Every structure is written in structure tokens, then in C-alpha cells.
């Protein structure tokens, strides 16, 4: 197990392998954090989150 096969490449959501390296991305309504791994909800009621 390497890159995306290794614990999802440490990505919160989508993991892609480009040129032998991990590229994380997020669902609509999320922004990729500065660390390029975490996904931050842009506004209230982000998709896929149970409410309160």
C-alpha cells in the first residue's frame, strides 16, 4: 500500500495520484485546507454531515 492506498493518502475526502504523488480534493461546499489534506465546510449545513 502506497500513496492513495495508504490510509487514503492522509486526505479527508477525495484522493488522486498525480505524477507519483497524492493530490487531495473535496466535495462541493468544502474548501481544501492550507495543509492540502483537510476539507473545510464553506458555509452552514455542508453535505454529508449529520445535523447537531
Amino acid at each position: 500500500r502506497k500513496l492513495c492506498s495508504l490510509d487514503n493518502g492522509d486526505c479527508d475526502q477525495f484522493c488522486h495520484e498525480e505524477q507519483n504523488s497524492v493530490v487531495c480534493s473535496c466535495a462541493r461546499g468544502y474548501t481544501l485546507a492550507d495543509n492540502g489534506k483537510a476539507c473545510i465546510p464553506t458555509g452552514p449545513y455542508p453535505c454529508g454531515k449529520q445535523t447537531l
Binding site: 466535495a27 449545513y45 445535523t51
Partner: peptide, 11 residues
């Protein structure tokens, strides 16, 4: 959207 009303994510 509110308590008990929110979308699921499309992967």
C-alpha cells in the same frame, strides 16, 4: 437546510 434537513455528498 436545518436540523434534520441537509444534503448527502456526491463522491
Amino acid at each position: 437546510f436545518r436540523m434534520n434537513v441537509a444534503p448527502a455528498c456526491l463522491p
